[PDB]
Amino acid sequence: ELQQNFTDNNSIKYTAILILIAFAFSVLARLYWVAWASEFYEFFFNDQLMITTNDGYAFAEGARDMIAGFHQPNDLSYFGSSLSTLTYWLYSILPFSFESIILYMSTFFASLIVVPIILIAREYKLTTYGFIAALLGSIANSYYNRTMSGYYDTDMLVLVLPMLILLTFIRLTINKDIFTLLLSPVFIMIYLWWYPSSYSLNFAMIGLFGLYTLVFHRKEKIFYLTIALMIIALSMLAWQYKLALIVLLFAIFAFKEEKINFYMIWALIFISILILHLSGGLDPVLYQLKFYVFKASDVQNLKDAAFMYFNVNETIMEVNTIDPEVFMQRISSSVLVFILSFIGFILLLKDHKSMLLALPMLALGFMALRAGLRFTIYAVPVMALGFGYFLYAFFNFLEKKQIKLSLRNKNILLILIAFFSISPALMHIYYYKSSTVFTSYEASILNDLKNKAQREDYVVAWWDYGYPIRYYSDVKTLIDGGKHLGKDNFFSSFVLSKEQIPAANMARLSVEYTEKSFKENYPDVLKAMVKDYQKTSAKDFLESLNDPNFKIDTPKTRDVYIYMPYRMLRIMPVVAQFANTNPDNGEQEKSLFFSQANPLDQDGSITLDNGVEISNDYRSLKIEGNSIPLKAFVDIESITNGKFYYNEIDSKAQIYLLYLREYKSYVILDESLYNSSYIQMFLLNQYDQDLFEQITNDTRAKIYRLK
């Protein structure tokens, strides 16, 4: 059984068996988390585990609304979005509950990545090494991270499609396959339909395919024709125009031998580049660079049409930077396998020139080093192929140096190598005991909100929570995962971190002006607010919001709820940072002192996660070797009852220490954050009953209503 030769085998039957085994491996591998999570009630809702990224609830809301057949005007529902649409088709065709489909789609579709990897390896007569590469590439750390069970997001096909395009380019270079003329464009369309941001990669790949053609195939018409077709597929033409051109020119080339003259096809390239140009061409690319590579604040380019806002880029986890070791493990689950993968990729390049067309994806992945961990994904399968090639190279070496190795022993060696190098990825899965976006309890609080509020009502929350809130509660939000620039975030930041009088003025005004902006398209909503109430600057207007005698000339068109969950506590200073910024200025206003930490236990002088020693006295802290006096120790025994004990310490001091008995947690904050709407209305349950009605009072979250 093991004595036979697998390396030389590239048959369709063997390749199908390998694809099936690798695909079952990919699925099986992301089934471990489901087995783990299933024993915890905290992760369920509606008899099924819950989704596992914040962004999944956007497409989940969209799917739900497609199934119901409508949404509200200007809830920003992803109705008609690609992933919502595929979810709706599968839901109508299959017998599983909505939550199960939405849970398992990534587990199915992300595993398709196994197909192009080993078909590409097969085009080079290396199918078995392709199998190894597909094993590594399907579960490699960062790829797994964004495609595990419950990662109900657009990432699940975001490498599958470009890899299929690559395969298509390879078949054209090796067999001059005429079906590329059809599939190359079609795939680009599918890619653009599934993930519009793909524009940039497509533009790069097509672009390189052009330069490649000017070099290695400067005379083969099929390359120029497919380039023109692909440029059309990149454009904003309606789909019927695109498909008409693609199928038309395809038949004309496939069944005509007098074919298309070269002048005509250069004309087609010119018409094409003109069309893509009208379609905005290259502008989306420079915009994406502006946000990710150059990290500019004003990315929409509105100098004095907007105010100046804190930059969200340095605030998003996905976009956070990463050190070389973590970069390498993100791509290959290990430093060693990464080095060998890179060597392998070089060797593959200087043996198969066509793999040059893989350089954009590779480049995108490396761009993570400047642009954030998010991007390593794009280098995972290319590099996996590199690793495949390294192995082929190595054993090739071992024969070109006449090393006595049986077939059985070469095969045992291969199986052992693949297992040992795939180990770090499996270990990563085992340890990546990721949890749900929210807890069942929060989903229950938000679903009861659904039965209490109206579809046309708003809840002011932080943008992190916009998609789940709209999913579980079916209401409107001010900000969410895709509406979260500084200019967007400012209002929720203000509502949550200022005092209650101006926070409630801002909740009414911000919800009303957002709703108006659907009909009026303000480039800056705050700027419409300012230049409406006859104020001179942003600061002038905002300071006038502090007035208990504030006139409100905008009539009330809906209820406005405010959502205050316990889990916001640890990101409160970051939330606060947005409204801490003078819009006239861009300038920071106050310093914001905050942190939350857990005791390690107790003897005698408590230590906490963050190295902050709490005095035995409960009268001073010791941060970084410096002892700082406390103004007060607030001992909170009931977040819902608002039962707490305010111990005065030093009227001359300025920092507060809070103990959360119901969580065994400590908070260290300043006067400005202590008086914020969140800390008062959530932690201490002190709210102006003339301004808000308490709708939900729970230790894990509070919901208030304006009036």
């Binding site: 990224t53 914040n54 962004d55 960062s142 991270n145 964004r146 605030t315 998003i316 986890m317 996905e318 956070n320 961990l373 998010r374 932080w462 943008w463 992190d464 995962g481 990101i571 200073p573 970051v574 939330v575």
Partner: peptide
């Protein structure tokens, strides 16, 4: 790590 959520 890979969340369109807030950190800090």
């Amino acid at each position: 790590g890979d969340q369109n959520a807030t950190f800090g």
